Subunit: 364 residues, 5 copies
C-alpha cells in the first residue's frame, strides 16, 4: 500500500504482477538493462561474448549462476505477461546459448577435473543447464534444445542411480544440497514436458538430505557433504538453506513448510522497528550476510516462494535502498550493489511466480 | 541561420551553402586535416591494416567498422561539394575500403563464434556498410579497383534477401535491425546506379515489412530489433535507430521518411534553452536525453540534414558541439570533450552531408 | 587464567583442548576460514586451484609450507575432537591433493633442478609430502594414498642409505637440518602404520647433526651444510633450531630436552614485565625476527611441543595482538599478519598435541 | 653573430667556424660523448641489435630509423670538420649502418603488412636513408665493407625509379613523399661520386615532377604527399616537408633551393622577440608553430645551416635550445626538456652540418 | 684508527684483517647478506635463480660483473680467515655455477653476436669466468671445473695468438683494456695452478696498451679501441684506468707504480678538509663519478691494491656514509646505494688482499 523509503515499487505491486498481467515499471527497466544497449547488454546476442559481465566485474566462476538466475526470472516474466512471453523466450534462447560457452563452464577443465563439463559430476553447472533447457521449452514450445535436454536428463538420472548417496557431486567429493535441488527440479520440468517419471528419484533424495546434512531443530542445512570421508562440514548455512528450501518447495511443499519457521528463527534478524530484516549466514554470530554474502538475497527469493510478503518487504527494504537504484533512460542501474549476483537475484525475487507455478506454465 | 552561435565554428547557413559555393567550410577542412595530416597516426595515413588513430581515441574494436563507414559517407559528400577535393576524397575512400577489410575491423564475427568468413551469410551491419562503401568509392573515382568484389557482395546480399522469409538480412544470427538493413538496401541502389541493374526492386517489400510490427505509427518510431526465430520484437522504441533509418530511407523513398519525420520529432526531440538548442531522448517513457548507445542527438543531426531541417540542425549542433570544446590548432580540428562514441565522425558527416539522393546522383568525375 | 589483552583465548584453554575434547572457538573460526567460503577457502576442493593463497599474496615457493603446516595442525584437530576427525581427514585429503599440483612443486623444474620433484634431492618438498601421506592415513584409516606413500618412503630411505652424510639435500649441495627432521619423522609415521623399521636410520642422523651442524653450548643449529665443500654456513639460526627441536622431540625427546634451555638462553628475549617474548634469529644482534622472520612463530610451536606454557603465552602475546585478529561471521581473519605463514603457524601452535602424540593417534 | 645569447652553449659564429678551425665546439664534443661514452646505453656503444639508448629516450619504434640516419648525417660532417675525429666518425657510421639493418628498425614494414623484405620494393624512407648511409660511410672511411650491399641497393632504387610512371618511389604503397625521395636521390649522387657512374641523371626528371602539383611555387612550399593510384595530392602545404626537401636538394641543384628559400621563409617563418628568435608554422592558415609532427623549426634550422643563413639559424636555435635546458655534466650533453622527437639528433646535425654539397666533395681519408 | 662519521670500521681495521685472521664485523654482515636468507640471498644455491639481483634492480647486463666482483672478494676472505675458507669456496662454487646461466651471458645472443658466449670475442664475460674458475680452484683445491678451465684458457690463449693487436675484443670491434686485464690475470692464475706459461703473452700486451691506448703523462687510459677503424675514443676514463691498474699491479707491479701518482693527479679530488675524496670520470670536467658512475668505487679498489690507506679512507668516507649502511639482525644493508654494483665493490675493496697475494694463496 505505502511505498517505503528508497523503494521502486511496493511489495503489494510485485505480488500483484501476475493478476494484473503486467510487470512493474522497475522490472520493465531491468529487462531494458538486460536487452537494450548494443553489444554490452547481457542478452544482446547468442554469441560467446561476455562484455556485460566484464563491466560488472563478474568473477568467471559466477557467470553460470548469473545466467541461470536471469533465466529463472525470465520464466516468471513469461508467466506474468503474455505480451512479454516472446521476449522472455528469446532471452532464454540466448541464456542457453551463452551457458554452453567455454568461458562459462571452463573452470571445470582449468581446475583439472576434465575436458567435458557434462559427462560426470559438476552438477552445479549441468543442473542449471538442464533446468534452463526445460524452462526454455515450457516458455516457447520450441524443440530447439530437446535433443540435448533428453541427453542431459538421462546423464543426470543415470548418475543418481549409480551413486551410493542420493544425488550428484559438484567438484569430485564435494556434495551440496543447493546444487542437487536444481538438478532434481530439472527432472520435474522434463517430466512435465515429456510425461516421464524421472522425478521418482526425489523421495530418496529428500530422505537422504534430512540425515546428517540437516539440523532439523534449527531448520538449517550444513554447508556440504564429502562422500569419500563421510564428513559433513560442521557449520549451518543460511544461503544454502534458503536456496534449497525455495527449490524444494516446488517439489515437496510440505518439506519447506516444516522447516521454514525454524530457518527464520535461526537466521533472520528483524530490525528498524519491524521495517527491515537481514540474514546471518551461520550460527554463533551476530553479523549479517557473511560468507558468500548472499544470505539475505536468497532469503528474499525464499520469502517470495513461500508467499511471505512481510519478510519479503523487510528484506527488500534492507537490500535495495542502500544500493541506490536509479532509472535512467528507462533502464535500471544500482550505484552500490551490495553483493555478487545483485541485480540478478533482486530481479528474480521481484518476478518469481513460484517453482510450482512455473512447472504448471500453460502452453504458448 | 547567419549569426554565429556561442561556441560554434560556422553558421548553419554556411554548412548548408557549401555545395552552392563549391567549398567546404574552414572547420570541415580542419577535420579533413585531422583525418589526413600527421604521419602514421592520422586515420587516413595509409591503406595498411594499421589502426593507431583509433587506438589514440580509445575506439572500442566493435565500433571501428562504424567509424570508417561514417567517415566514408562524409567523404562522398566532400567529393560532391568541392571538385578540387574530389581526388582527395577518392583517395580517402580507397583507404577506407582497404581498412574496412582488415580482420581488426571484422574479426569480432569470428571471436564471438559466428564464423570465420564475415561476408558469406548474416552480418549485415558489416557487409552492408562495406558494400555501400564499395559503391561510393566507385561513384567518386570512376575506378573499378573494387568492382569484382562489389559485384560479388551485392549478389550475396540480394540472394540472402531472396532466400529469407522476412524482408532483409540479420546481423548476429537471429538479430534483425532496421537501421543495418537500411544501409544494405541503399547499397543496392548505388550498385544499380553504377551498373544499370535492378537489385533495388527488393526495397518495396522491405519498406512494407518494416511498417508492420517493427514500427509504432503513433510515434513514427521503430522498435529496437526483431528476432525471427521467436518472432519477438524488443518492445522499446529507439530514436537513434529511427533517425538513422529515416535518413537512409529518404534517399530511396523520400515520401516514407517525410511521412514519419514530424512524429519522430514530437516523440523524441526536446527543444530547450529558449528555442536555441535541442537534445534527443533515446526511448519512450523517460525525460533523459541520449541514453542507450548515446547517439540519438548525433544521428538526429544527420537526419535533420538529410531532411533539410535547418532549424533542428542548428539546435542540435548548439547542444552537441560547444560542450565538446572544439579547437583548431595548426589548421586541424580537435575536441577536448567528445560527448559520445563516433563523435568527430558523426559531426563531420552531418556538416557535409549532401543528401543520400544527391550522392546517388553524383555526376561522373 | 586471565585473558591477556588482545588475545582470543587463554593459554590454559589451548592446553586444555584435548582434555575437553573440544577446540576453542577461535580455532573453530580458523577452521571456518579454512573451509567455509566457496572457491576461495584453502580447503574448498581437491582441485589444482590456489585462490586462497593468491588472496593472501603467498609467494609460490611458500605454498608447500603453508599446506604442510595446515596439515600438521589438522592432524592435532583430529586428536582433540573426535567429532571433527572426519572433517580433519577430508581437509588432509585436500591438502595431499593440492600438494601434488605443479603450482606447488614446480619451482624445482623452473629453477633447473629436474622435471620430477620426487626422484632425488628436494627433501623439503618430498619430506613434507611423505609426512602428509602418513598423517592422512593415521587420521582416516584410508589407503587412498598408501601406494604412493610406500613408494616415497622407499625413495627417501634409499637416498639416505646411498649418501655419505646422514640425510638428503634440498637443492643440490644444500643440506638443512629442519628439512631433514620432517623426512625422518615421516619414516616414524610410516613405521607406525606398517610395522616396519625405516626409523632405524634416525640414530645415525642425530649423531651426524650433533657435529659441525650444532653449537652444543648455545643449543643452536647452524644455517646449513654443503656436502661438496664440507662447509657449514657459520651463523646459528633460531627458526631452524626451533623447528628442528620440535620435530625431533617426537623421535628422541631427550635430544630436544638437552638443548632446549640453551636455545632459550641464546635466542629468546622476555620483555614487557615478563608478559611477552620475542626471538632473535641469529647471534650478535638485538633485533627480533630477522632473516625469514619466523623465529618467534616457530618458537611458539616449540614451546607447545615442549609443554612450556609460560613461553607459549609470552610469544603469543607478542605475535597475536598486533596482528589484530577479528572473528566476523564466525570466521577468523588478521588485519596485520606479522610474517609469512602467519595464520598457518598460529593455527598449528594453538592445536598442536605433540609429534609423539600424533604418532600414537588411536585408530578411527 | 659573436655575443652568446641567453641559454645558448656556443655562438652561431662558433658553429659556422668549426670547419675553418678544424675543431668541433665543446658542446658538440659533449654531444659526441653522449653518443659514445657510457657502456651499453650510449647509442653508438656497439654494432649489436641493441636499442637501449632509444628505449631510455622513449623513441617510438617508427622513429628509430630517422634517429640513426640523422646522427649519421651529422657524423659525416664531423669527419669533415676535424680530421682527428674522422676515425671516430667512421666507427660510429659503421655502427649506424649495422643498427639500421636490425629488424627492430625496419620491422614496421612487415608488422604493418607490407612485406617481409624491407628493400625489394617501395619503402623509400627506410631504404633511401640506408643507401645514403652506405655512401657516407664509404666517403668517410674509404672502406668497402658495405660496397656489395651499396651497389645492390643503388640498383634496386634506380630500377624502381625507371619502372615507375611518376618520378621516384613510394614509402607505404601509394604514399609518395618528396622529402623521402630527396634522400634517395642524394644517395645516387653519393654513389656516383664514389663509383664514377651516372645514376644521378634521373634527378632532372624528378625536380621537374615535384614542381607540378606537389609544389605551390608562389609560397615556395611542397604539399604533404602524392598518391599515384588516384593522382591526388593532400591539399595542405608542409613546412617540415619543405625545409628537409630544400636542404637536400641544395646539395644537388643549388639554384632550385635558392629560388624557393625566400618564399618558404615568408610563408612559414615567424620572427619574434624583437628579432632575437624565430619559430616555424607547419602549414598555412594558422598562427600556431610546430604543429603536425612538431619538426618544422628543427628542420628549418638544418635548412638555414645548409643555405648559410646565420641570422635565421641563430633565431631558430634561440627558440629551440634554451627551453630544452641543456646541461653538460661530466663533459657530456643532456637536455632536461627536449621539445620534440629527434631533438638531440637534429640539433646535433644542424650544429655540425657542412652542407650536402660539401659532403659530396669530401676528400679521401 | 679513529672511526670516521657514518663509517662501520676504521681503515686500520680493514687493512689489519689478514694479520688478525679475521674479517671485521661489517664484512661478516655483508657475508650474511650474501648467504643467509632462503631463496633471496645471492649465494643461496647453485641454481639459475636470480631473485637477489631482481630485488636490487640489477640490470641484466650487469649481473656478470656483480657475480665476478663478489667472487673476487670471496677469494680474499679465504685468505683472511682460514675458518671462512670453506664458506668462501662454497660461495665461489655457486658463483661459477650462476655465471654459466643464460640469464647472465644471454645478452650475447640477444644482441645478435652468437649463440655460444665463449667461442670467440666476448672477453668481458669469458675473462671473468676464466678468472673465477681459477680462483675457485686456488681456494678449494677442487678440480670440479678444471676440464672447463683448461678449455677456456686455451680458447683465450689461441685468440690472443691469432689477433694482430695484443688481446681480445668484447663485442665485435670493441676493445677495452680493463676487460683484457682480467683475461690476462686469468692466465697467471691458470699458470699458478698448472705450471704452464700462458702468462708469457702479458709482456706484448703491456707494450701494446702503452701506445695509443694510454696518455702516459696523465697516467690514464682511453675509453676504448676499435680495430676495424683503428679509432681510439678520444676521452680518458678514470674507472677504466683504476680497474686496469689494479689488476695489472698483480702482474707487473712496476707498471701500475709508474702511472699511479699521475692517475691520482689527473682524476682525484680531495675535499672536506682532507677527510674525503671523489673521482672525476674524464678530463675537462669538475663533476665526480660521471659515465657509468664507478670511478670512485674502482679507485677505492685501486687504493687498496696499492696500499694507499689515506686515499682508501678518503674514498670510503665519500662513498659509504651517504649510502646509510645499517646492520639489522647481523646482516648489512644500504638504504641509498650510490651506484650500480655498490655492495659488491665496497665488499671487494674492504677485503681485497692484493691480486698478487691471491695468486700466491697457500693450498688448503
Ligand atoms: C519419452 C522417451 O523418449 O522415452 C521422452 O523422454 O519424451
Amino acid at each position: 500500500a505505502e511505498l517505503p523509503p528508497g523503494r521502486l515499487a511496493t511489495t503489494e505491486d510485485y505480488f500483484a504482477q501476475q493478476a494484473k498481467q503486467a510487470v512493474t515499471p522497475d522490472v520493465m527497466a531491468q529487462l531494458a538493462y538486460m536487452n537494450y544497449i548494443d553489444f554490452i547488454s547481457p542478452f544482446y546476442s547468442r554469441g560467446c561474448s561476455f562484455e556485460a559481465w566484464e563491466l560488472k566485474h563478474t568473477p568467471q566462476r559466477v557467470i553460470k549462476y548469473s545466467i541461470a538466475f536471469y533465466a529463472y526470472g525470465l520464466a516468471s516474466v513469461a508467466l506474468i505477461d503474455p505480451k512479454l512471453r516472446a521476449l522472455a523466450g528469446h532471452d532464454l534462447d540466448i541464456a542457453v546459448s551463452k551457458m554452453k560457452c567455454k568461458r562459462v563452464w571452463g573452470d571445470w577443465e582449468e581446475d583439472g577435473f576434465g575436458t567435458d563439463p557434462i559427462e560426470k559430476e559438476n552438477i552445479m553447472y549441468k543442473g542449471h543447464l538442464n533446468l534452463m533447457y526445460g524452462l526454455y521449452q515450457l516458455v516457447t514450445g520450441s524443440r530447439r534444445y530437446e535433443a540435448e535436454h533428453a541427453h542431459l536428463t538421462r546423464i543426470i538420472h543415470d548418475e543418481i542411480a549409480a551413486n551410493p548417496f542420493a544425488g550428484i557431486v559438484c567438484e569430485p567429493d564435494n556434495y551440496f544440497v543447493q546444487c542437487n535441488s536444481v538438478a532434481y527440479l530439472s527432472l520435474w520440468v522434463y517430466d512435465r514436458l515429456h510425461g516421464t517419471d524421472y522425478r521418482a528419484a526425489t523421495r530418496a533424495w529428500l530422505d537422504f538430505i534430512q540425515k546428517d546434512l540437516i539440523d532439523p531443530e534449527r531448520g538449517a542445512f550444513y554447508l556440504s557433504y564429502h562422500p569419500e570421508s563421510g564428513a559433513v562440514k560442521p557449520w549451518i548455512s543460511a544461503y544454502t538453506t534458503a536456496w534449497t528450501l525455495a527449490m524444494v518447495h516446488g517439489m515437496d511443499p510440505a518439506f519447506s513448510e516444516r522447516y521454514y519457521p525454524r530457518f527464520k528463527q535461526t537466521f533472520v534478524e528483524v530490525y528498524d522497528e519491524g521495517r527491515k530484516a537481514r540474514v546471518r549466514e551461520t550460527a554463533g554470530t551476530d553479523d549479517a550476510d557473511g560468507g558468500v554474502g548472499l544470505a539475505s538475497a536468497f532469503t528474499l527469493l525464499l520469502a517470495r516462494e513461500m508467499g511471505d510478503q512481510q519478510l519479503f518487504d523487510q528484506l527488500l527494504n534492507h537490500l535495495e535502498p542502500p544500493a541506490k537504484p536509479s532509472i535512467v533512460s528507462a533502464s535500471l542501474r544500482y550505484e552500490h550493489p551490495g553483493s555478487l549476483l545483485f541485480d540478478e537475484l533482486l530481479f528474480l525475487a521481484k518476478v518469481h511466480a513460484g517453482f510450482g507455478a512455473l512447472l504448471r506454465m500453460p502452453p504458448p
